């Protein structure tokens, strides 16, 4: 099963962004995702479920041989773009790997629907979720970018509401400082071919509309993070994000949280949309998958 | 059987580091140190071989039963104290848990011998363990505090001077900037009864005595960390020295080193010591070997 070389494949990514319309319309710029990220493989015998949470929409995804386990999955792209539909290349594998039901949630987006709508729907399907579960012990939290800071924002929020903690959070390059100013926004910049660092300022301008960016809700590396969930974290190198992860890690960890961060070598931002072309991407899921199911009981 | 409630551990440590006395001759400490690390126990059944690398008085430590991997270890102490007998307590548990044999290196402590002295030291040690051990793919470095700076700068200085590298590097709360500067320092410093924050600044000077604080082979931190092996991060969340394991990542991450970094919640600094009290450390201990001796292959 043929794999590029990590470096070849960021040179192709080197390309795409080189090559990239400067001012894509957003709607235009959303349907190129939908389009594209089609041709990407699903796993195998994931069936699709077109569903709600809480009276969100959400994508189900199961093998015929689910044990109880459940994921609440939260995709990425900025806040402004990304839909559960883009992302079932990374989801499908999550739910077969663990034999789990992942629910892939479709939250409000910007700029339509500023800070507060999607953490606010988070927040409303975890609740559906732990009726439909049973028991938070059997729930992962877990997404990547954008969704990677939901995964935390919308927790924080949950145990404010009173809400019982799942029973574990999995971030992929968590988008979690919308400042944009720690040490790797400008000493990786360069080597970011997919995060969007000259814009990043504008892309999250979208969802913080009024707001203060330091707000722990849209930045919760400057939250109380005390009494959230055992979390995981997978970054790649070649990240203008490296240090959001770090410094969640960072933070989390001195407010008493369980901490697991591993960085991998010549990975782009959310790499893990690319075991096609990369095996670090499926070592990634693999091992993402065995903690999922670990401390699923 | 028994252990304590992680908080109150820490207070059994608060309650140490307020009646300890306020400037302690260094051989005292030193001496203290030894009487008092002679208590903790040691692995059942790892035999204690009083040996040499290189020139450098080493105790060597295994089973019988143990496989050919080979882990050189460097203990911590602030450069300026700490030696094979008082990590007794930690090394046993390694050789033991990883069916290897561990070399406990003897390198010089500062102020008699400042920097580069324990750097010269490690390598020549590791150097003359090449031959030994007939191969770099059967070696993992270790280390403690110190042990954990050294155990970088080493492998840094190893590169440099053209010798192969390890199958990977281990480091237990990791003292790797000199500087003391970092947000941990500041912020946790009244959490930490063990790193000894307000004396670690003068202690330290030392090490460095007249030397730049940011010099690679002292704050790794600061170096070009490209080519490195693969390296497995624990450390504690009571930590002044916090930001130096998620900045080591941070950097390690960058220059395209594979970093795992644990954090754990309530533990003090180089827990692993502590099996004894905190369950914790068992743990730490029982996911280190398994992460060693799965790099053995």
Redesign the interface.
Known sequence: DTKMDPRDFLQLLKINAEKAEKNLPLDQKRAGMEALCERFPRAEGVELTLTDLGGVPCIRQATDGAGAAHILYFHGGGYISGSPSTHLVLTTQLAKQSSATLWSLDYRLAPENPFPAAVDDCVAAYRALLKTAGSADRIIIAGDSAGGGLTTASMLKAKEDGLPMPAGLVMLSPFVDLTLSR??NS??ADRDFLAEPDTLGEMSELYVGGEDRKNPLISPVYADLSGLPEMLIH?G?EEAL??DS??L??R???????????????MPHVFQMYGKFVNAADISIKEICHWISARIS
Chains 1, 2 share one sequence.
């Open positions: 040490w790797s000493n990786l970054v190198s490296l240090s770090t410094t890690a960072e989390a960890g001195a407010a008493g949280v369980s901490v697991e961060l591993k960085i991998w070598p010549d």
